[PDB]
Amino acid sequence: ENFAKLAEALYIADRKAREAVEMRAQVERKMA
Amino acid sequence: MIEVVCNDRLGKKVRVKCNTDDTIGDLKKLIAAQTGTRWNKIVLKKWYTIFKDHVSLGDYEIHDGMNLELYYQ
Amino acid sequence: EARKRELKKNKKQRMMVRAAVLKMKDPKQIIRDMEK
Amino acid sequence: DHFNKTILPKVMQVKNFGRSGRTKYTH
């Protein structure tokens, strides 16, 4: 039951982390 | 020097140490000394290849371990 | 090791077959009946 | 017994699958 909720939380966390990492890498590439 | 196995399937598995160029009379003496039977009564065979009391040992060319079916006269 | 027992069984069967073949048409069965 | 029986690796009494005995007069 809670496994699906934990998996959805992990997926949302991974998506947010990927978006933030892409933004940070773009900012660094623009800075360099 | 040669080691011979005067063997039989009737409670006589004897190991005599024979000389190289020796005769068979002395070999029969040793077989009696280790087996416990009169000298002239012993008989040695290998499928009716009766070895005689004058033909030498190196004549047949026995070597270490050549067992011999023992029989009595 | 068991191959020896298998070969022994095969040889025993072959020997029984040969004995039956020699006895069925034997001189005392076939040739003896040939005179009758 | 024609061999030396000293160059052998550790020892060889008999590999005939019957070594019931264990002795060599070391003590």
């Binding site: - | 063997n7 290998k46 499928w47 371990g65 011999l68 | - | 024609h2 690796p9 005939n16």
Partner: protein, 254 residues
């Protein structure tokens, strides 16, 4: 260095000899020379590359030929000491210490020769590389192989060879190296020569074979339950003698 390792190798070789000599007759005989095995398949035998001390007795090297005067008996060279058929395979491997030292000495000369060729406008001269042809770190034949360009575009074969145990249902001893990229991991023809020398040459090692006669006065290869029968017949005198089994001689009906 592992004494237990060598002792266990000897025990395992003896265990194989069990049923290697017991497969024929359930006796476990006394003497039974290893020459029934250490003759390679080129002559007919097995090719048992052994490591344990298989002492060959001096009373198993007798041969004669009745040609012009009579049966001139002879014997191989065993007056010094016992016959050491397989003294040690470690002596004929060039171990990793010698391998690394020879590599450090040889790859530098290879680079020097390559620089001299690039300067002198020379190609891959196999004659010049014949001195540094032995093993390299991988086999130098791979450097001058036929699939050099085709094999150079594949990096990372060690992991593939490692996980081949999952990609295949059979043990693949390829951890040591790759047969293509790394080349060969040993050489043994010198060991075969040493073996045939210790057995008293071909004529000495073959006095047990039945072709003392057979209309074959010389060595001419004609190698055509085929191998089991061929083996137990080609060693029937060396096997079915009297100084191995007990002396319960039995003759046949005819």
């Amino acid at each position: 260095n592992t004494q237990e390792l060598l002792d266990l190798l000897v025990k395992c070789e003896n265990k194989i000899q069990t049923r290697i000599k017991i497969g024929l007759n359930s006796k476990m005989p006394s003497r039974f020379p290893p020459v029934v095995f250490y003759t390679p398949k080129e002559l007919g035998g097995l090719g048992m590359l052994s490591m344990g001390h298989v002492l060959i007795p001096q009373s198993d090297l007798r041969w004669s030929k009745q040609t012009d005067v009579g049966i001139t008996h002879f014997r191989s060279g065993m007056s010094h000491e016992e016959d050491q058929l397989i003294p040690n395979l470690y002596r004929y491997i060039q171990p990793w210490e010698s391998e690394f030292i020879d590599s450090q000495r040889v790859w530098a000369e290879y680079a020097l020769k390559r620089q001299e060729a690039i300067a002198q406008n020379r190609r891959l001269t196999l004659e010049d590389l014949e001195d540094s042809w032995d093993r390299g770190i991988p086999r130098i034949n791979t450097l001058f192989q036929k699939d050099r360009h085709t094999l150079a575009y594949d990096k990372g074969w060690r992991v593939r060879t490692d996980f081949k145990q999952y990609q295949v249902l059979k043990q693949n001893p390829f951890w040591w190296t790759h047969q293509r990229h790394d080349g060969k991991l040993w050489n043994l023809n010198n060991y075969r020569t040493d073996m045939i020398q210790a057995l008293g040459g071909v004529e000495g090692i073959l006095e047990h074979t039945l072709f003392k006669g057979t209309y074959f006065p010389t060595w001419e290869g004609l190698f055509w339950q085929i191998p089991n029968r061929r083996f137990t017949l080609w060693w029937s005198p060396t096997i079915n003698r009297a100084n191995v089994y007990v002396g319960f001689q039995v003759q046949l009906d005819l």
